[PDB]
């Protein structure tokens, strides 16, 4: 009963001026025990390392009966006019600290919409 872990949706649009994007990870079908869920950002046409966004990777620890957590990603606005750019987040194999598992949405494409 350890849970099935998922993003809300596989694609999201955010403004280049959003500042901080807050991405949710949901636990469904069971909330028993402490579970570690790895996550990471991956570049698309948007560049990481603090250029278009800040690299954000690590692990979420869900406590017993905890069913939602947040990954906060810094999205960096600029003064250039360009096309919309993309990056990704992924969640990795969950582990107890009966097994927890990944659910429907395990890769998320973020489309950063030019703010002008």
Q: Residue numbers of the site for Ca ion (CB under 5 A)?
A: 52, 78, 80
Tokens linked to 2: 């350890």
Whether residue 65 is annotated as binding a ligand: the answer is no
Residue 55, SS3 per DSSP: coil
* Cross-strand pairs, 72: 22
**Cα–Cα distance, 90 to 98 (Å, whole number):** 23
Whether residue 114 is annotated as binding a ligand: the answer is yes
Whether residue 80 is annotated as binding a ligand: the answer is yes
Give the shortest CB-85-to-Ca ion separation in angstroms.
Answer: 7
- Residues of the binding site for Ca(2+): 16, 52, 78-80, 114
- Residues of the binding site: 16, 52, 78-80, 114
């Amino acid at each position: 009963h350890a849970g099935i872990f998922t993003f809300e949706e596989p694609v999201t649009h955010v403004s280049e001026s959003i500042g901080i994007m807050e991405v949710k990870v949901l636990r469904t079908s069971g909330a028993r025990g402490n579970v570690i869920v790895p996550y990471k950002t991956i570049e698309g046409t948007a560049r990481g390392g603090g250029e278009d966004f800040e690299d954000t990777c690590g692990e979420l620890e869900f406590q017993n009966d905890e069913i939602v957590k947040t990954i906060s990603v810094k999205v960096i606005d600029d003064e250039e006019y360009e096309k919309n750019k993309t990056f990704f987040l992924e969640i990795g194999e969950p582990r107890l600290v009966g097994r927890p598992i990944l659910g429907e949405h395990t890769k998320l494409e973020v489309i950063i919409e030019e703010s002008y």
